[PDB]
Design an enzyme around this catalytic site. Structure first.
Site, PDB file in Angstrom:
ATOM      1  N   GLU A  89     -14.318  11.834  12.237  1.00 54.05           N
ATOM      2  CA  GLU A  89     -13.395  12.235  11.132  1.00 54.05           C
ATOM      3  C   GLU A  89     -14.158  13.294  10.327  1.00 54.05           C
ATOM      4  O   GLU A  89     -15.168  14.004  10.705  1.00 54.05           O
ATOM      5  CB  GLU A  89     -13.291  11.013  10.029  1.00 54.05           C
ATOM      6  CG  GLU A  89     -12.107   9.772  10.532  1.00 54.05           C
ATOM      7  CD  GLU A  89     -11.648   9.090   9.634  1.00 54.05           C
ATOM      8  OE1 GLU A  89     -10.853   8.102  10.091  1.00 54.05           O
ATOM      9  OE2 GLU A  89     -11.786   9.160   8.362  1.00 54.05           O
TER      10      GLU A  89
ATOM     11  N   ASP B  39      -8.573   3.496   8.388  1.00 52.59           N
ATOM     12  CA  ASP B  39      -9.929   3.297   7.510  1.00 52.59           C
ATOM     13  C   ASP B  39     -10.063   2.021   6.570  1.00 52.59           C
ATOM     14  O   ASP B  39     -10.971   1.940   6.198  1.00 52.59           O
ATOM     15  CB  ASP B  39     -10.132   4.649   6.776  1.00 52.59           C
ATOM     16  CG  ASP B  39      -9.989   5.953   7.379  1.00 52.59           C
ATOM     17  OD1 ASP B  39     -10.366   6.294   8.557  1.00 52.59           O
ATOM     18  OD2 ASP B  39      -9.505   7.082   6.713  1.00 52.59           O
TER      19      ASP B  39
ATOM     20  N   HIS C  97       0.720  -1.170   0.142  1.00 48.90           N
ATOM     21  CA  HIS C  97      -0.020   0.019  -0.173  1.00 48.90           C
ATOM     22  C   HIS C  97       0.728   1.289  -0.051  1.00 48.90           C
ATOM     23  O   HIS C  97       0.189   2.436  -0.210  1.00 48.90           O
ATOM     24  CB  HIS C  97      -1.121  -0.191   1.185  1.00 48.90           C
ATOM     25  CG  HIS C  97      -2.461  -0.280   0.211  1.00 48.90           C
ATOM     26  ND1 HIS C  97      -3.157   0.474  -0.269  1.00 48.90           N
ATOM     27  CD2 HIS C  97      -2.704  -1.665  -0.106  1.00 48.90           C
ATOM     28  CE1 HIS C  97      -4.285   0.010  -0.579  1.00 48.90           C
ATOM     29  NE2 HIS C  97      -3.892  -1.497  -0.924  1.00 48.90           N
TER      30      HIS C  97
HETATM   31  C1  LIG Z   1      -3.607   1.913   0.167  1.00 50.38           C
HETATM   32  C2  LIG Z   1      -4.158   2.523   1.411  1.00 50.38           C
HETATM   33  C3  LIG Z   1      -3.265   2.950   2.529  1.00 50.38           C
HETATM   34  C4  LIG Z   1      -3.755   3.290   3.650  1.00 50.38           C
HETATM   35  C5  LIG Z   1      -5.328   3.718   3.633  1.00 50.38           C
HETATM   36  C6  LIG Z   1      -5.898   3.154   2.598  1.00 50.38           C
HETATM   37  C7  LIG Z   1      -5.590   2.798   1.560  1.00 50.38           C
HETATM   38  C8  LIG Z   1      -6.427   2.341   0.418  1.00 50.38           C
HETATM   39  N1  LIG Z   1      -5.757   4.218   4.793  1.00 50.38           N
HETATM   40  C9  LIG Z   1      -5.058   4.172   5.694  1.00 50.38           C
HETATM   41  C10 LIG Z   1      -5.721   4.849   7.156  1.00 50.38           C
HETATM   42  O1  LIG Z   1      -6.865   5.063   7.222  1.00 50.38           O
HETATM   43  N2  LIG Z   1      -4.673   5.325   7.928  1.00 50.38           N
HETATM   44  C11 LIG Z   1      -3.340   4.996   7.985  1.00 50.38           C
HETATM   45  O2  LIG Z   1      -2.802   5.114   9.415  1.00 50.38           O
HETATM   46  N3  LIG Z   1      -2.712   4.579   7.020  1.00 50.38           N
HETATM   47  C12 LIG Z   1      -3.558   4.204   6.003  1.00 50.38           C
HETATM   48  N4  LIG Z   1      -2.840   3.899   4.683  1.00 50.38           N
HETATM   49  C13 LIG Z   1      -1.671   3.946   4.592  1.00 50.38           C
HETATM   50  C14 LIG Z   1      -0.738   2.668   5.140  1.00 50.38           C
HETATM   51  O3  LIG Z   1      -0.945   2.593   6.558  1.00 50.38           O
HETATM   52  C15 LIG Z   1       0.635   2.365   4.628  1.00 50.38           C
HETATM   53  O4  LIG Z   1       0.742   2.483   3.211  1.00 50.38           O
HETATM   54  C16 LIG Z   1       1.452   1.445   5.104  1.00 50.38           C
HETATM   55  O5  LIG Z   1       2.736   1.174   4.812  1.00 50.38           O
HETATM   56  C17 LIG Z   1       0.839   0.040   5.595  1.00 50.38           C
HETATM   57  O6  LIG Z   1       0.575  -0.410   4.180  1.00 50.38           O
HETATM   58  P1  LIG Z   1       1.340  -2.131   3.908  1.00 50.38           P
HETATM   59  O7  LIG Z   1       0.918  -3.083   4.924  1.00 50.38           O
HETATM   60  O8  LIG Z   1       0.755  -2.435   2.470  1.00 50.38           O
HETATM   61  O9  LIG Z   1       2.731  -2.018   4.096  1.00 50.38           O
HETATM   62  P2  LIG Z   1       3.996  -1.698   2.878  1.00 50.38           P
HETATM   63  O10 LIG Z   1       3.329  -0.516   1.976  1.00 50.38           O
HETATM   64  O11 LIG Z   1       4.187  -3.067   2.122  1.00 50.38           O
HETATM   65  O12 LIG Z   1       5.277  -1.224   3.470  1.00 50.38           O
HETATM   66  C18 LIG Z   1       5.460  -0.038   4.335  1.00 50.38           C
HETATM   67  C19 LIG Z   1       6.717   0.088   4.708  1.00 50.38           C
HETATM   68  O13 LIG Z   1       6.909  -0.694   6.133  1.00 50.38           O
HETATM   69  C20 LIG Z   1       7.888  -1.758   5.756  1.00 50.38           C
HETATM   70  N5  LIG Z   1       7.450  -2.857   6.471  1.00 50.38           N
HETATM   71  C21 LIG Z   1       6.523  -3.691   5.864  1.00 50.38           C
HETATM   72  N6  LIG Z   1       5.935  -4.639   6.556  1.00 50.38           N
HETATM   73  C22 LIG Z   1       6.822  -4.518   7.618  1.00 50.38           C
HETATM   74  C23 LIG Z   1       6.994  -5.366   8.780  1.00 50.38           C
HETATM   75  N7  LIG Z   1       6.443  -6.510   9.025  1.00 50.38           N
HETATM   76  N8  LIG Z   1       8.070  -4.860   9.728  1.00 50.38           N
HETATM   77  C24 LIG Z   1       8.594  -3.971   9.617  1.00 50.38           C
HETATM   78  N9  LIG Z   1       8.702  -3.124   8.351  1.00 50.38           N
HETATM   79  C25 LIG Z   1       7.700  -3.424   7.592  1.00 50.38           C
HETATM   80  C26 LIG Z   1       8.126  -1.706   4.184  1.00 50.38           C
HETATM   81  O14 LIG Z   1       9.443  -2.049   3.815  1.00 50.38           O
HETATM   82  C27 LIG Z   1       8.001  -0.171   3.851  1.00 50.38           C
HETATM   83  O15 LIG Z   1       8.953   0.661   4.432  1.00 50.38           O
HETATM   84  C1  LIG Z   2      -9.095   4.637  -3.390  1.00 50.28           C
HETATM   85  C2  LIG Z   2     -10.109   5.350  -2.158  1.00 50.28           C
HETATM   86  C3  LIG Z   2     -11.491   5.222  -2.053  1.00 50.28           C
HETATM   87  C4  LIG Z   2     -12.204   5.438  -0.668  1.00 50.28           C
HETATM   88  N1  LIG Z   2     -10.816   5.799  -0.006  1.00 50.28           N
HETATM   89  C5  LIG Z   2     -10.974   6.279   1.315  1.00 50.28           C
HETATM   90  N2  LIG Z   2     -12.103   6.872   1.732  1.00 50.28           N
HETATM   91  C6  LIG Z   2     -12.467   7.287   2.840  1.00 50.28           C
HETATM   92  N3  LIG Z   2     -11.355   7.263   3.859  1.00 50.28           N
HETATM   93  C7  LIG Z   2     -10.180   6.698   3.622  1.00 50.28           C
HETATM   94  N4  LIG Z   2      -9.107   6.472   4.017  1.00 50.28           N
HETATM   95  C8  LIG Z   2      -8.286   5.970   3.696  1.00 50.28           C
HETATM   96  N5  LIG Z   2      -8.614   5.674   2.292  1.00 50.28           N
HETATM   97  C9  LIG Z   2     -10.155   6.364   2.282  1.00 50.28           C
HETATM   98  C10 LIG Z   2      -9.708   5.526  -0.892  1.00 50.28           C
END
Ligand SMILES: *Cc1cc2c(cc1C)nc1c(=O)[nH]c(=O)nc-1n2C[C@H](O)[C@H](O)[C@H](O)COP(=O)(O)OP(=O)(O)OC[C@H]1O[C@@H](n2cnc3c(N)ncnc32)[C@H](O)[C@@H]1O
Ligand SMILES: Cc1ccn(-c2ncnc3[nH]cnc23)c1
Length: 457
Positions: free
Chosen positions: A235, A124, A61
């Site tokens: 929110e 979220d 993500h």
């Molecule tokens: C795509 C997205 C992201 C998102 C969101 C909604 C969507 C559609 N809503 C969020 C929300 O309401 N609140 C919030 O705090 N964040 C929100 N996001 C963003 C999301 O938290 C971040 O993208 C986060 O990176 C988690 O996503 P994911 O689990 O897919 O992890 P990654 O992107 O692959 O890696 C992120 C970084 O962390 C390192 N990593 C990954 N796993 C680990 C572990 N197990 N231990 C240590 N480090 C780790 C990766 O290397 C990278 O640097």
């Molecule tokens: C691509 C997409 C469609 C809906 N969202 C979200 N809508 C409302 N809160 C959010 N928070 C994180 N992603 C959100 C993100």
């Protein structure tokens, strides 16, 4: 126990993320079975002559290649046998041990089916990994009260940049524990996280109310986060008045979004508890929209929007997302400066949080004020249109230029910085010194999460 994979499909997936821009390819993808396997691979990278890059990938993500390991190895943390939730009389509540790659949606289904328990603080969107959100903060409408997800974890097992497995908490190896939390993957891979749990509510009263005045909207959001009756989620969103009398007062509308959680025991008092809290507010009369639904359904609302977008081929498009933490003293300037000024691509989220719910010992970077806002520009570029992404990226730079030019002490959440002086300014002198010292101790060869672009070999 684990296996190296060179399958082109695994390589392509490990070379992309939700942002849809950064495409750095690894040499191989590693599929571990346990913590020991992760430790073995990191151990190999640490002992190699070259010292190849190793990055854990959660659900992919990231917006700008944070989980990418250019010419190295991506650890696919995704998933038998799961630990059951546990009660502790010492902590006075429940916890659950989860694998670092577990998705929050799977954590939720697991804890609910084993005692009707659930985490207290969310994101979220639930199709995110535990390790991934704990490496940032993990925020949603509950953070104002419970703090972010990094304030709701008791213990971790971390595989350091030297391939050593360390159990850490507030009382055991605290430097590593607090460093890793909000640490951007810089000091190790989370293989286990001990998540705080509460008895889960059964249902949610989900409410949305409109405002044409930013001063009244922000004043109500700030009052709600200071609340003993209270909403369980707070929110908000910024919307153009046209895309819906109210128009004669403002061309920009602000939607307040709140919830009230309830179960069999509180179901009789929910309607009046809501009425009492709503009566104290200054939203526009006749603009209240209400929904009653199960807790899982409310928590999974973004996955439902995702399925609709995937059907229209509108999900796998570039997402040049910008996330800012804005000090409450400077929020007013965003209205004419950005919402009416600079502005797009999708939703604009806005809500305040309480800094006292964030442990200052963690690596997370927040503004130097008691109340601060998340301001999130959740843009989607047009499918197959590189110019749409370019125009949105210029819009993001104009927002950053505006903050700099007017002295708004904003801080990026999920920071997209890549230059040393940008990271130094982001952290500030004291936090930068602490961050660099932790890197020298836990990842001296800068093997881990190099896609973040903070350190070099
Ligand atoms: C795509 C997205 C992201 C998102 C969101 C909604 C969507 C559609 N809503 C969020 C929300 O309401 N609140 C919030 O705090 N964040 C929100 N996001 C963003 C999301 O938290 C971040 O993208 C986060 O990176 C988690 O996503 P994911 O689990 O897919 O992890 P990654 O992107 O692959 O890696 C992120 C970084 O962390 C390192 N990593 C990954 N796993 C680990 C572990 N197990 N231990 C240590 N480090 C780790 C990766 O290397 C990278 O640097
Ligand atoms: C691509 C997409 C469609 C809906 N969202 C979200 N809508 C409302 N809160 C959010 N928070 C994180 N992603 C959100 C993100």
């Amino acid at each position: 126990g684990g296996r190296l994979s060179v399958d082109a499909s695994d390589i392509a997936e490990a070379s992309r993320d939700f942002g849809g821009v950064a495409r750095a390819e690894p040499m191989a993808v590693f599929h571990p079975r346990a913590a020991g396997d992760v430790a073995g691979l990191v151990g190999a990278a640490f002992r190699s002559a070259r010292g190849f890059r190793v990055s854990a990938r959660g659900h992919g993500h990231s917006i700008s290649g944070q989980a990418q390991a250019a010419g190295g190895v991506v650890v696919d943390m995704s998933r038998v046998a799961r630990a059951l939730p546990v009660h502790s009389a010492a902590l006075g509540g429940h916890y659950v041990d989860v694998w670092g790659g577990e998705l929050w949606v799977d954590v939720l289904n697991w804890t609910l089916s084993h005692g009707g328990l659930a985490p207290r603080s969310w994101t979220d969107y639930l199709y995110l990994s535990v390790g991934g959100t704990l490496s940032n903060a993990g925020i949603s409408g509950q953070a104002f009260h419970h703090g972010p997800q990094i304030s709701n974890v008791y213990e971790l097992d971390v595989v350091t940049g030297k391939g050593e497995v360390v159990t850490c908490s507030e009382t055991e190896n605290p430097d590593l524990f607090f460093g890793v939390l909000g640490g951007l993957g810089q000091f190790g891979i989370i293989t286990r996280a001990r998540i705080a749990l509460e008895r889960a509510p059964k249902r949610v009263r989900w409410i949305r109310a409109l405002y044409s005045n930013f001063s009244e909207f922000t004043a109500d959001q700030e009052r709600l986060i200071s609340l003993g009756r209270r909403f369980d989620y707070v929110e908000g969103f910024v919307v153009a008045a046209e895309g819906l009398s109210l128009k004669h007062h403002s061309s920009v509308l602000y939607c307040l979004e709140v919830t009230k959680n309830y179960d069999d025991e509180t179901a009789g008092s929910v309607d009046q508890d809501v009425d009492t809290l709503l009566g104290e507010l200054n939203f526009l009369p006749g603009t209240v929209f209400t929904t009653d639904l199960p807790y899982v359904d409310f928590l999974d609302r973004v996955h439902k929007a995702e399925l609709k977008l995937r059907a229209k081929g509108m999900w796998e498009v570039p997402h040049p997302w910008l996330n800012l933490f804005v000090p409450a003293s400077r929020i007013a300037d965003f209205d004419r400066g950005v919402f009416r000024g600079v502005l797009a691509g999708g939703p604009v989220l806005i809500y305040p949080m309480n800094k006292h719910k964030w442990d200052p010992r963690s690596s997370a970077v927040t503004p130097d004020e008691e109340v601060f806002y998340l301001v999130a520009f959740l843009r989607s570029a047009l499918p197959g249109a590189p110019e749409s992404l370019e125009a949105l990226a210029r819009q993001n730079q104009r927002i950053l230029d505006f903050c700099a030019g007017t002295g708004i002490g904003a801080k990026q959440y999920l920071p997209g910085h890549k230059a040393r002086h940008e990271w130094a300014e982001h952290f500030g002198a004291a936090r930068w010194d602490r961050f660099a010292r932790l890197k020298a101790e836990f990842d001296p060869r800068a093997i881990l999460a190099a896609g973040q672009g903070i350190f070099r070999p």
